[PDB]
Amino acid sequence: ILWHGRVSSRATCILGQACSEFAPLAPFSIAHYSPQLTRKLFVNAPAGI
Amino acid sequence: STMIRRNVPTYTAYASELLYKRNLTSLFYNMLRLYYIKKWGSIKYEKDAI
Amino acid sequence: MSSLLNSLLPEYFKPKTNLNINSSRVQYGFNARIDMQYEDDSGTRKGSRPNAFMSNTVAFIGNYEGIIVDDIPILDGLRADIFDTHGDLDMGLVEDALSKSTMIRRNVPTYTAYASELLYKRNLTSLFYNMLRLYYIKKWGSIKYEKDAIFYDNGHACLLNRQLFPKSRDASLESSLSLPEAEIAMLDPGLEFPEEDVPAILWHGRVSSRATCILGQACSEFAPLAPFSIAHYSPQLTRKLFVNAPAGIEPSSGRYTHEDVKDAITILVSANQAYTDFEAAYLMLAQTLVSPVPRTAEASAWFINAGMVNMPTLSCANGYYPALTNVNPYHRLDTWKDTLNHWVAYPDMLFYHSVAMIESCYVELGNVARVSDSDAINKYTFTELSVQGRPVMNRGIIVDLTLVAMRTGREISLPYPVSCGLTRTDALLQGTEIHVPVVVKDIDMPQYYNAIDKDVIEGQETVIKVKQLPPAMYPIYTYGINTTEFYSDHFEDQVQVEMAPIDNGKAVFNDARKFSKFMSIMRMMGNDVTATDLVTGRKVSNWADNSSGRFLYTDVKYEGQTAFLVDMDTVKARDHCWVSIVDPNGTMNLSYKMTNFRAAMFSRNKPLYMTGGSVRTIATGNYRDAAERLRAMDETLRLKPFKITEKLDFRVAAYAIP
Amino acid sequence: STMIRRNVPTYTAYASELLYKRNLTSLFYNMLRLYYIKKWGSIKYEKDAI
């Protein structure tokens, strides 16, 4: 994916959790079961992650 | 463009497959769910409820 | 802006280039001929003072403190190709411009990504400001500051320099600062990724041995000993400074003269194409070069707490992108080089531009402090309605330029809405009591001044409670151009005090307006009048100043009901060249006329004369007509002959032109 | 109205959530009550009055 300038300290944590398995305990509608989207995600940002 | 000259021939060959991989719907879907989980995070679910 | 500050100067004032300042106090003013008249039922008594000196004392001391703030970027200088129709950096033409240049091919993709952040870091105002201060420190370096010296004295109350400025050691201006040098590294053109939070500047040819020492000291902390105006406290601008000079940077010399600082500025502005940045730095220093000595003892409330100077953060990314600066720059106004060209020609003219600006501001803050909060244009909301732009915050130069616009009564226009410099309106907006310290001389002080103690032995340190701020300066350069009835700065004026013979000299002024004009004109005539308020029971004296020689109504030091008893058999003749009121009977009519004006300056109780060449009004056209001319005389050495002519003697020869 | 343009995406996100809840009416209400408590601060309330 592409990015504008520097990937912030919090943007790493959000993208990391977005591309992961949802394994819920309580049956909630916005926290349903989803498979692992991807294992690794590249980011073309000249300013380091 | 501002590409490395030794990569142009090898990257152009791959273009036929890779340029038709454009669907970010799954990523935006999960990121929208994380927004509402942290906003309305204080809602409760009881096991023995009606 | 040299242009707008030039128009503030009077018509009769014809300035010269050089001004040999050799002290930390100057009495600028004018000599006028006053034809006073006193008419009465008995008869008329005429007087005439041929040389009457009206002065405003201006010093080189004043407590200030610099703080680094975030300000808008100044986009004047960059090439006109990369800009779009609206006037903002169209990114896409930047990538096109960098590609078709003399850049390393492996750096193009990584440098273009950074462009979005780095190209909007253009503000060199902080660097030019410090380099201008170094010029004047080395020029007027021999001025002295004594610790136990008289800041103000009016006979009754005295205020020393120890009182206002503690932590203050006596020293010369040259010996005040001990500036440490910042590192001036050479930029490697083959650097992988640009280092943000480190500014990189351009240079023409080789950085000289003295240029290193000047740039090193300009980007450093100012930690002064003596409270000087051009050597106030400033934070460290930057730690390291890159310079993209293919010819290597020579090491620091250590010493430099004031002429070498002018050399450093002229190269920096030309290479970086930063003329609007210099214009901002020129107006900043114009505010904070000289501070006014207070007119009255209770007018020291303005200079108790230190006014903050807003210096914009040093940020420049020209060193990383040499291609984007060329000989065809983008500029808003056509007269964008006028301010630098004026300074290079006439450096010492800044002194006259400085006093013109502070006199304009402190006069208007005098008659702004005397308006009630319940009004449309009041103390808090006089800046907002006047400003028709989009500045970040209404502070610094915006508040000082809007006060000048009110004084002259004209429209002031700047190319960029920059908000940097000193903020004066600090003590005003607080709207609280200020406690100024004073050392007493006489024992009958606390009747006149609103003192904290009622009985005080001589040589005691007391406190005066100032509620409403009196005017700090009287209008002198702006005399009778935009006249108000408060100051009463007319050429012709008259007052009619109505008394009957049944009254034995005693007159009660029910009106406040004509009481002010009576007490003022009596002081021109050299008469010491002492009125007493009937309601409160305090006393006021017209002799409350030794500079202007006028009586403003704020010298009463109290707002109440107006019932001033003046006894006209206790009037004492004080000054020379005076008309006598021996014994008046019936209606009195006082009047004066100011006819001609001659510019005069005093220093160390001696006349200070202007020397050098005749200063002109430099226009953009006056230089570029010589560029239109080009000296188009083909540079061909054409030698013309002279025919010898013989006459009677023949021993001696005589040459003719044809 | 800034030189540091790295913070614009973050600033916009927080501003959008806060601007739709701005109200200083409750602060001025208490500040006005403190003015009149000090001014008329000699009024007596007797419990066994009519």
GROMACS .gro file of N, CA, C and O in nm, chain C residues 432-512:
model
  324
  531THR      N    1  -0.586   4.581   3.570
  531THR     CA    2  -0.564   4.570   3.717
  531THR      C    3  -0.472   4.684   3.763
  531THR      O    4  -0.416   4.754   3.676
  532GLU      N    5  -0.457   4.702   3.895
  532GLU     CA    6  -0.364   4.801   3.956
  532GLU      C    7  -0.220   4.751   3.938
  532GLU      O    8  -0.197   4.630   3.957
  533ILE      N    9  -0.128   4.843   3.905
  533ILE     CA   10   0.019   4.817   3.893
  533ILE      C   11   0.090   4.896   4.004
  533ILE      O   12   0.056   5.015   4.023
  534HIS      N   13   0.185   4.832   4.072
  534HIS     CA   14   0.261   4.886   4.188
  534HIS      C   15   0.403   4.922   4.144
  534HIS      O   16   0.490   4.832   4.146
  535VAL      N   17   0.426   5.048   4.105
  535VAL     CA   18   0.559   5.101   4.061
  535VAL      C   19   0.636   5.146   4.186
  535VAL      O   20   0.580   5.214   4.271
  536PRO      N   21   0.765   5.107   4.202
  536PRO     CA   22   0.846   5.154   4.314
  536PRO      C   23   0.899   5.296   4.290
  536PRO      O   24   0.917   5.332   4.174
  537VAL      N   25   0.922   5.373   4.397
  537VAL     CA   26   0.971   5.514   4.394
  537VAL      C   27   1.052   5.541   4.521
  537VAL      O   28   1.012   5.491   4.628
  538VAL      N   29   1.162   5.617   4.508
  538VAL     CA   30   1.241   5.674   4.622
  538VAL      C   31   1.206   5.823   4.632
  538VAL      O   32   1.215   5.894   4.530
  539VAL      N   33   1.164   5.868   4.751
  539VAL     CA   34   1.112   6.006   4.777
  539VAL      C   35   1.229   6.103   4.792
  539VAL      O   36   1.339   6.059   4.833
  540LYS      N   37   1.206   6.231   4.760
  540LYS     CA   38   1.304   6.343   4.774
  540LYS      C   39   1.256   6.440   4.882
  540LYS      O   40   1.331   6.460   4.980
  541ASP      N   41   1.136   6.497   4.865
  541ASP     CA   42   1.070   6.586   4.965
  541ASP      C   43   0.990   6.499   5.064
  541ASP      O   44   0.990   6.375   5.048
  542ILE      N   45   0.924   6.564   5.161
  542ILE     CA   46   0.843   6.498   5.268
  542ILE      C   47   0.692   6.517   5.239
  542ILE      O   48   0.612   6.444   5.300
  543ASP      N   49   0.656   6.608   5.147
  543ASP     CA   50   0.515   6.643   5.114
  543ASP      C   51   0.475   6.579   4.980
  543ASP      O   52   0.402   6.644   4.901
  544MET      N   53   0.520   6.455   4.955
  544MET     CA   54   0.496   6.378   4.830
  544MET      C   55   0.352   6.326   4.823
  544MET      O   56   0.284   6.351   4.724
  545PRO      N   57   0.301   6.252   4.925
  545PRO     CA   58   0.178   6.172   4.908
  545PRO      C   59   0.046   6.251   4.894
  545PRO      O   60  -0.056   6.186   4.878
  546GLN      N   61   0.050   6.385   4.899
  546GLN     CA   62  -0.065   6.473   4.862
  546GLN      C   63  -0.084   6.470   4.710
  546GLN      O   64  -0.200   6.458   4.665
  547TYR      N   65   0.026   6.483   4.634
  547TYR     CA   66   0.027   6.490   4.485
  547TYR      C   67   0.002   6.350   4.426
  547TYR      O   68  -0.102   6.332   4.360
  548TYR      N   69   0.095   6.257   4.449
  548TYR     CA   70   0.088   6.117   4.400
  548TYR      C   71  -0.003   6.033   4.490
  548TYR      O   72  -0.007   6.059   4.612
  549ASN      N   73  -0.073   5.935   4.432
  549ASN     CA   74  -0.159   5.837   4.504
  549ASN      C   75  -0.067   5.731   4.566
  549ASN      O   76  -0.063   5.617   4.514
  550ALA      N   77   0.006   5.768   4.672
  550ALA     CA   78   0.107   5.684   4.741
  550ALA      C   79   0.038   5.588   4.838
  550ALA      O   80  -0.082   5.609   4.868
  551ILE      N   81   0.111   5.486   4.884
  551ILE     CA   82   0.061   5.379   4.976
  551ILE      C   83   0.068   5.428   5.121
  551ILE      O   84  -0.020   5.388   5.200
  552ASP      N   85   0.169   5.511   5.154
  552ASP     CA   86   0.188   5.574   5.288
  552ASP      C   87   0.152   5.723   5.280
  552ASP      O   88   0.167   5.782   5.171
  553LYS      N   89   0.107   5.780   5.393
  553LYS     CA   90   0.057   5.920   5.405
  553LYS      C   91   0.167   6.010   5.464
  553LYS      O   92   0.163   6.132   5.435
  554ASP      N   93   0.257   5.955   5.546
  554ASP     CA   94   0.378   6.023   5.599
  554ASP      C   95   0.500   5.936   5.565
  554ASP      O   96   0.501   5.818   5.606
  555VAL      N   97   0.598   5.993   5.493
  555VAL     CA   98   0.722   5.923   5.448
  555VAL      C   99   0.841   6.020   5.460
  555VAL      O  100   0.839   6.125   5.393
  556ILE      N  101   0.939   5.986   5.545
  556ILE     CA  102   1.069   6.059   5.558
  556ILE      C  103   1.148   6.044   5.427
  556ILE      O  104   1.132   5.939   5.360
  557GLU      N  105   1.229   6.145   5.393
  557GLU     CA  106   1.311   6.152   5.269
  557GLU      C  107   1.408   6.033   5.263
  557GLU      O  108   1.461   5.994   5.369
  558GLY      N  109   1.431   5.979   5.143
  558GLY     CA  110   1.521   5.865   5.116
  558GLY      C  111   1.457   5.729   5.142
  558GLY      O  112   1.532   5.630   5.145
  559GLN      N  113   1.324   5.724   5.160
  559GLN     CA  114   1.246   5.598   5.183
  559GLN      C  115   1.198   5.543   5.048
  559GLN      O  116   1.162   5.625   4.960
  560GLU      N  117   1.195   5.410   5.034
  560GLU     CA  118   1.144   5.337   4.914
  560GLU      C  119   0.995   5.307   4.934
  560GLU      O  120   0.964   5.219   5.017
  561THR      N  121   0.908   5.379   4.862
  561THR     CA  122   0.760   5.369   4.870
  561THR      C  123   0.705   5.306   4.741
  561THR      O  124   0.786   5.266   4.655
  562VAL      N  125   0.572   5.297   4.730
  562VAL     CA  126   0.498   5.240   4.613
  562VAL      C  127   0.382   5.334   4.577
  562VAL      O  128   0.311   5.378   4.670
  563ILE      N  129   0.365   5.362   4.447
  563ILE     CA  130   0.252   5.443   4.391
  563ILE      C  131   0.154   5.346   4.323
  563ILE      O  132   0.201   5.259   4.246
  564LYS      N  133   0.024   5.361   4.349
  564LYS     CA  134  -0.086   5.280   4.289
  564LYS      C  135  -0.137   5.352   4.163
  564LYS      O  136  -0.206   5.455   4.178
  565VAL      N  137  -0.103   5.300   4.045
  565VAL     CA  138  -0.148   5.351   3.912
  565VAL      C  139  -0.262   5.262   3.862
  565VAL      O  140  -0.239   5.140   3.846
  566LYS      N  141  -0.380   5.320   3.839
  566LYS     CA  142  -0.505   5.250   3.798
  566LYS      C  143  -0.526   5.267   3.647
  566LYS      O  144  -0.527   5.164   3.577
  567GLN      N  145  -0.541   5.392   3.601
  567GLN     CA  146  -0.552   5.429   3.458
  567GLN      C  147  -0.413   5.471   3.407
  567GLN      O  148  -0.349   5.554   3.475
  568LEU      N  149  -0.370   5.416   3.294
  568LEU     CA  150  -0.234   5.438   3.236
  568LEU      C  151  -0.231   5.574   3.167
  568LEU      O  152  -0.306   5.596   3.072
  569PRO      N  153  -0.145   5.669   3.212
  569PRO     CA  154  -0.132   5.799   3.145
  569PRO      C  155  -0.047   5.787   3.018
  569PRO      O  156   0.028   5.690   3.004
  570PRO      N  157  -0.056   5.882   2.922
  570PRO     CA  158   0.027   5.877   2.801
  570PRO      C  159   0.178   5.884   2.831
  570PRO      O  160   0.218   5.970   2.907
  571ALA      N  161   0.255   5.793   2.772
  571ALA     CA  162   0.401   5.776   2.794
  571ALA      C  163   0.480   5.877   2.710
  571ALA      O  164   0.591   5.915   2.755
  572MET      N  165   0.428   5.918   2.594
  572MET     CA  166   0.491   6.017   2.502
  572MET      C  167   0.386   6.119   2.456
  572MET      O  168   0.268   6.083   2.445
  573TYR      N  169   0.431   6.243   2.430
  573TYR     CA  170   0.352   6.354   2.371
  573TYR      C  171   0.377   6.357   2.221
  573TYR      O  172   0.490   6.335   2.178
  574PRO      N  173   0.275   6.384   2.135
  574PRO     CA  174   0.296   6.389   1.990
  574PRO      C  175   0.384   6.507   1.947
  574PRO      O  176   0.351   6.619   1.982
  575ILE      N  177   0.493   6.479   1.874
  575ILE     CA  178   0.596   6.579   1.831
  575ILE      C  179   0.615   6.570   1.678
  575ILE      O  180   0.602   6.675   1.612
  576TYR      N  181   0.649   6.452   1.626
  576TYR     CA  182   0.661   6.426   1.479
  576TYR      C  183   0.522   6.429   1.415
  576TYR      O  184   0.510   6.480   1.302
  577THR      N  185   0.420   6.376   1.484
  577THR     CA  186   0.277   6.375   1.442
  577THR      C  187   0.204   6.490   1.513
  577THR      O  188   0.099   6.462   1.576
  578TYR      N  189   0.256   6.612   1.503
  578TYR     CA  190   0.200   6.735   1.566
  578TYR      C  191   0.112   6.809   1.465
  578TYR      O  192   0.166   6.862   1.366
  579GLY      N  193  -0.019   6.811   1.489
  579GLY     CA  194  -0.119   6.886   1.410
  579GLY      C  195  -0.138   6.829   1.270
  579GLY      O  196  -0.154   6.910   1.177
  580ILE      N  197  -0.136   6.696   1.256
  580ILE     CA  198  -0.169   6.622   1.129
  580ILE      C  199  -0.303   6.550   1.146
  580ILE      O  200  -0.380   6.547   1.047
  581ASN      N  201  -0.330   6.493   1.264
  581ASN     CA  202  -0.460   6.432   1.303
  581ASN      C  203  -0.488   6.473   1.448
  581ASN      O  204  -0.468   6.390   1.540
  582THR      N  205  -0.531   6.598   1.467
  582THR     CA  206  -0.542   6.666   1.600
  582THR      C  207  -0.666   6.614   1.675
  582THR      O  208  -0.772   6.598   1.611
  583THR      N  209  -0.650   6.588   1.805
  583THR     CA  210  -0.758   6.555   1.902
  583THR      C  211  -0.758   6.663   2.012
  583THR      O  212  -0.653   6.728   2.031
  584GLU      N  213  -0.871   6.679   2.081
  584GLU     CA  214  -0.892   6.786   2.183
  584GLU      C  215  -0.830   6.746   2.318
  584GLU      O  216  -0.816   6.835   2.404
  585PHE      N  217  -0.793   6.618   2.337
  585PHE     CA  218  -0.728   6.567   2.461
  585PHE      C  219  -0.586   6.625   2.471
  585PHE      O  220  -0.556   6.691   2.573
  586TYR      N  221  -0.503   6.600   2.370
  586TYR     CA  222  -0.362   6.649   2.361
  586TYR      C  223  -0.361   6.800   2.336
  586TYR      O  224  -0.272   6.868   2.392
  587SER      N  225  -0.455   6.850   2.255
  587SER     CA  226  -0.472   6.993   2.217
  587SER      C  227  -0.343   7.044   2.151
  587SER      O  228  -0.287   7.145   2.198
  588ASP      N  229  -0.300   6.975   2.044
  588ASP     CA  230  -0.174   7.003   1.969
  588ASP      C  231  -0.208   7.090   1.847
  588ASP      O  232  -0.166   7.054   1.734
  589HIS      N  233  -0.277   7.202   1.869
  589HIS     CA  234  -0.315   7.302   1.766
  589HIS      C  235  -0.200   7.401   1.746
  589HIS      O  236  -0.113   7.409   1.835
  590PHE      N  237  -0.201   7.473   1.633
  590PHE     CA  238  -0.109   7.586   1.604
  590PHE      C  239  -0.161   7.712   1.676
  590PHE      O  240  -0.080   7.782   1.739
  591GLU      N  241  -0.292   7.738   1.665
  591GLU     CA  242  -0.364   7.849   1.732
  591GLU      C  243  -0.464   7.790   1.833
  591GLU      O  244  -0.533   7.693   1.798
  592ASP      N  245  -0.470   7.848   1.954
  592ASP     CA  246  -0.565   7.808   2.061
  592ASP      C  247  -0.592   7.929   2.153
  592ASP      O  248  -0.503   8.015   2.162
  593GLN      N  249  -0.709   7.933   2.216
  593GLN     CA  250  -0.749   8.039   2.313
  593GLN      C  251  -0.842   7.981   2.420
  593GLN      O  252  -0.909   7.880   2.392
  594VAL      N  253  -0.843   8.043   2.539
  594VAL     CA  254  -0.929   8.006   2.656
  594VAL      C  255  -0.980   8.135   2.721
  594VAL      O  256  -0.902   8.231   2.730
  595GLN      N  257  -1.107   8.135   2.765
  595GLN     CA  258  -1.175   8.252   2.827
  595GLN      C  259  -1.222   8.213   2.968
  595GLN      O  260  -1.327   8.146   2.980
  596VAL      N  261  -1.146   8.252   3.071
  596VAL     CA  262  -1.179   8.235   3.215
  596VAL      C  263  -1.257   8.359   3.261
  596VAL      O  264  -1.199   8.469   3.256
  597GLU      N  265  -1.383   8.340   3.304
  597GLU     CA  266  -1.477   8.450   3.338
  597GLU      C  267  -1.478   8.470   3.490
  597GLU      O  268  -1.522   8.377   3.562
  598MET      N  269  -1.429   8.585   3.536
  598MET     CA  270  -1.423   8.627   3.680
  598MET      C  271  -1.484   8.767   3.694
  598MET      O  272  -1.473   8.846   3.598
  599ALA      N  273  -1.545   8.795   3.809
  599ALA     CA  274  -1.601   8.927   3.848
  599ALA      C  275  -1.511   8.990   3.954
  599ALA      O  276  -1.446   8.919   4.029
  600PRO      N  277  -1.505   9.126   3.964
  600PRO     CA  278  -1.427   9.192   4.069
  600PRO      C  279  -1.466   9.158   4.214
  600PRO      O  280  -1.380   9.169   4.300
  601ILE      N  281  -1.592   9.119   4.238
  601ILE     CA  282  -1.645   9.076   4.371
  601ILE      C  283  -1.564   8.955   4.421
  601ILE      O  284  -1.540   8.947   4.544
  602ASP      N  285  -1.525   8.864   4.331
  602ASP     CA  286  -1.434   8.750   4.360
  602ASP      C  287  -1.291   8.805   4.375
  602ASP      O  288  -1.246   8.875   4.283
  603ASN      N  289  -1.224   8.773   4.486
  603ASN     CA  290  -1.088   8.824   4.521
  603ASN      C  291  -0.983   8.727   4.465
  603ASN      O  292  -0.906   8.669   4.544
  604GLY      N  293  -0.981   8.710   4.332
  604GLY     CA  294  -0.882   8.628   4.258
  604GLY      C  295  -0.923   8.482   4.243
  604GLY      O  296  -0.870   8.417   4.151
  605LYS      N  297  -1.014   8.432   4.328
  605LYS     CA  298  -1.049   8.288   4.339
  605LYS      C  299  -1.150   8.252   4.229
  605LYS      O  300  -1.258   8.314   4.227
  606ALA      N  301  -1.115   8.155   4.143
  606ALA     CA  302  -1.197   8.105   4.030
  606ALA      C  303  -1.217   7.954   4.043
  606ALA      O  304  -1.118   7.884   4.069
  607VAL      N  305  -1.341   7.907   4.026
  607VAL     CA  306  -1.380   7.763   4.029
  607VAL      C  307  -1.414   7.719   3.886
  607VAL      O  308  -1.507   7.777   3.827
  608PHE      N  309  -1.341   7.619   3.834
  608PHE     CA  310  -1.361   7.560   3.699
  608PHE      C  311  -1.458   7.442   3.710
  608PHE      O  312  -1.415   7.331   3.748
  609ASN      N  313  -1.586   7.466   3.678
  609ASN     CA  314  -1.692   7.362   3.672
  609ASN      C  315  -1.665   7.268   3.553
  609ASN      O  316  -1.689   7.147   3.568
  610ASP      N  317  -1.617   7.323   3.441
  610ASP     CA  318  -1.581   7.248   3.317
  610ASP      C  319  -1.438   7.194   3.332
  610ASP      O  320  -1.352   7.266   3.387
  611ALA      N  321  -1.415   7.071   3.283
  611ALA     CA  322  -1.286   6.998   3.287
  611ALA      C  323  -1.199   7.034   3.166
  611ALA      O  324  -1.076   7.034   3.180
   0.00000   0.00000   0.00000
